[PDB]
Symmetry: D2
Subunit: 218 residues, 4 copies
């Protein structure tokens, strides 16, 4: 890689509000960027215990750790050392909407992610405010190039306590801070699991596997 080692670490500084409730989070992560393997530990440093499902924040806590085949240009890795930013819109089926923005920078062997999260209109008796969600189903992000940016769309779904799903549509725009070689139409399959946490989720550990690929049936 030259700029990105086979083994990297990263820090996460997140801030934001959910239905008006302010909060702050810090995380320490590590993983093999070229293997698409990752793990991170979060701490609600302010505003905890959170009155909403942690699952809505788990996806906001690292694109550089995506396994890209050699024949598919890696938009995000190419952006360093300059780095990139991403902007995300999350539309939940019960009307809740979230806007999230990240700034990813690099320093030596450590990535630094600054995140601003804004979510609202989560129904008081809904899955999020009642904490009835149980993790995200594995997902598949559809990605393509446009205006020098990489745009990703994903039909996410949170498993519900008692069965059923709580749908959320994701739209993420990755913006490199310098022009890079754009990839073709492809996908990134992911698995995001909370592997550990304390009773009130003021402490959480997450694992994620991200692998890019070309259309299965082409």
């Amino acid at each position: 890689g030259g700029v990105i080692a086979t083994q990297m670490t990263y820090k996460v500084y997140m801030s934001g509000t959910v239905n008006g409730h302010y909060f702050e989070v810090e995380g320490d992560g590590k993983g093999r960027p070229y293997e698409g393997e990752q793990t991170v530990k979060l701490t609600v440093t302010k505003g905890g215990p959170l009155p909403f499902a942690w699952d809505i924040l788990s996806p906001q806590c690292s694109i550089p750790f995506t396994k890209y085949p050699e024949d598919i240009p890696d938009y995000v890795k190419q952006s360093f050392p300059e780095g990139f930013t991403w902007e995300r819109i999350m539309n939940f089926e019960d009307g809740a909407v979230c806007t999230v923005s990240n700034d990813s920078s690099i320093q030596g062997n450590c990535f630094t992610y600054h995140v601003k999260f804004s979510g609202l209109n989560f129904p008081p008796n809904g899955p999020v405010m009642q904490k009835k969600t149980q993790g995200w189903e594995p997902s598949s992000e559809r990605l393509f190039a446009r205006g020098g940016m990489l745009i990703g769309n994903n039909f996410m779904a949170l498993k519900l306590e008692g069965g059923g799903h709580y749908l959320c549509e994701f739209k993420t725009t990755y913006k490199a801070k310098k022009p890079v070689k754009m990839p073709g139409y492809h996908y990134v399959d992911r698995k995001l699991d909370v592997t550990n946490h304390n009773k009130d989720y003021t402490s959480v550990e997450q694992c994620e596997i991200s692998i890019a690929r070309k259309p299965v049936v082409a």
Copy 2:
């Protein structure tokens, strides 16, 4: 299969309007339902030549022909001989919206699809009314069970003449006419290509490969 042979044929009767323009279509198709392989020939029997891109109609012309692994229940095949119906909403990025409804019945070795298509708000100088589209990128439909129905979401994209993409979000609801064994969270990867057509697309031939699968990274 018992009800669905290894080799089947099917007839398509489509009717509808696009920005007020009425039209009728008839098709003769054939394929191997258990192999997910298909081919169909369409004829614009009324209202032709069509003043809009044929690509918006190609996806409306056959779920029974989807290759499902044995460990994933095939919602659509299970529905026969009773059959099923599907309702679809297509949201294009330039504001155009389409609502499509199908009724799939079976008689011996032949499937019969009756289709009603309603599309409007296609900008006069847009890709559809100017016929600047060049086929659909291969897609991946996210499917899950709910209320006894199978619901599918797909981020489709039409290739544009001169480069670039014209996005369309698909939402399809499959309704069996009798209760069947519901599948888990899965996907269906597809490839839909117009393999032949005359000058004004009043005649068209399409090929499609549909394969179901479980999450890649799980």
Copy 3:
């Protein structure tokens, strides 16, 4: 008016499907186009009794009968004798979507409206399929000019049996068949009431008052 008399009549021919259920409707209407007063009688000539709330069809049954102040150009009236068409998208809060297209022509003292209605994804246990709706709250359509077309947006709401509202967002695009003088940013306030009907709504009578105006607080 010269082309539009002070008292006019009109015929309505509607066809369409709701969750796959086909139907046909015919109506005889009359009103004072310059006073914005209207009344029409509908008959479900085919596919009745309808298994869904009639309220979703009441708004599809006459823009020429809108009272426009003299200082606000009347886009629709100006279009005659050539006439115009309108395309409408209806988004209900429970996910149901409808696409509607009309063609308005004139012959002497009578207007003729041909309508195609396509609605689907109405939840089986929802307000529409269970017939729990009780009319539309009076509405206010926001209108402005663009590309020679008049575009209207309206936040509609159906009153529910037992209290509460069932929201629906309307987007209507009016397309004159000949260039006309475009109006500025304005609104059209309406009142649409079912004044009579038989037991299964296979027969219905509707009254409507439509008045254009400039912003109240400007």
Copy 4:
């Protein structure tokens, strides 16, 4: 009013990001709450000069100053001294989305508004990032009660330099911190004008007239 004087003042503390760009704003306002008349002066205290149109922030800078007829219960005024909060979603026609949350408190004769603004996906060559907008057309918010909250929908539009409009749909949810008497289906007409500002809009003065009313044609 007892709690709200005929003449009041208020302070505004806003913070947020637009396409990743952080900023802070402070304002001093005054007005006659029962007359629906208002005026406020803003200062970009941090992150200026802003690289985006100020118009997107003008609507985030005071519901208490709305003239409500006596026969229509004033949800917001009733909430004091406890106060209320509002959550807003802004959907622009070019894809940009904003989520805004406010907290309105009262102390004597002064209202205090704390605001968090999150906006993103504003196209770099769009009206907002290029500063081609010229104020909001007067608007009309559709309001109704639900779950003890007041919900408002508004079809907003920004005038564009060179003619034309840039559409934005508003959805605002007002949440009183204590139960109050809920109003019926009604509207609030508004006029929001930037009456003064310096060259780079790091200083701005805004005027607003807000009047509630029942449906015009009922």
